[PDB]
Amino acid sequence: TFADDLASLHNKLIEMGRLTEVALQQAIEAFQTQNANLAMAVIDGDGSIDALEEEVNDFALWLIAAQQPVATDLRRIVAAIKIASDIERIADFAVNIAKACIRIGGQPFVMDIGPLVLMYRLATDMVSTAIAAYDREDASLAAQIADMDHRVDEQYGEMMASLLAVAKTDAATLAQMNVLALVARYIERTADHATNIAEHLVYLVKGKHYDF
């Protein structure tokens, strides 16, 4: 049943990702469309993934202590725990982009949220990619994720641009730009995690390190 166990542990994770995927999808839509009811769907339904992560640690720790995994299987059980956390953190930033969507209520953005939306989706994809890479166990999608990162960078600068330029300085509108800035950061944390997941996937496989 062993081989089967590692197959489910594998699906437990891929599962966390399927959900974090969704949560991410809505978190952004919720924010861009300014949908409070949606932002909440995101919050209320998150502790659920914290649940899966525990499951994934209990299960893995068990194997590591019961079925006595051999080197190779042991690395894939370990990376399984490191990746689960990254999926968890990402999911958490989602919950936060959702709280920020609320922070600002419904008084239409002080500027265009277009580049920010694309910066989010860019990162989101980095996740899908990284998780897909984990699923298939493809250690080469990584270097490709590297580029979506340069894109998240140039996308970011192009954020501070349309932001710290626009003059119309006022308490309410500033408290507004901040939330936008906060969101820009959670998108970069979400990206760095996809990258983190890519690192594991790559070390597990190539024993080498994630490229630029």
Place this chain on the structure above:
Amino acid sequence: TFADDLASLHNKLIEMGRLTEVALQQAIEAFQTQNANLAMAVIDGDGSIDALEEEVNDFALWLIAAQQPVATDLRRIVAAIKIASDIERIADFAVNIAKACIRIGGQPFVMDIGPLVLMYRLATDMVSTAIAAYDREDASLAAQIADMDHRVDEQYGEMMASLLAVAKTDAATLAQMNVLALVARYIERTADHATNIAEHLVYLVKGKHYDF
């Protein structure tokens, strides 16, 4: 000898941090002073930490499979592996800030690297803090690390500022600003990891989650 084992596993990590600490210290000095010989000290002496991380996984995985850790001890052996990786990644960004220091040779910065230096040190401290928090196992230093983050944020904007403003557009000088931008990102990845380490330390202890 068990209790003793967990004490050394604990010191293995605190050890990785003592070194990553240094590496970080020099990486920045090297860059700000533009010291190639130093940037190299950083590169050449890094595979050494990748070494410690392996040690920390082999050792922990062993306990988890040999001395049969009980719940509490088991969480502290697990977080021990998650944190080791974060220390590893941070150390790696160091190696990269060091490669970027070289990327630009010695033709004095197109602008003032003061705010960037402070943004680096700010993150660096977040690390020391997070690692110190791990050592003592103080789950409250976290919320304090949270603030050094808001500071890393406001410090960042104040980066794009003196950057995308300065007009003097030219191939060499641009290829120059980019490296600076790249460095700004590795500093933010280093911060998000300190934050990551803080998360573990907090979940392990409070079972709850790392604050804003």
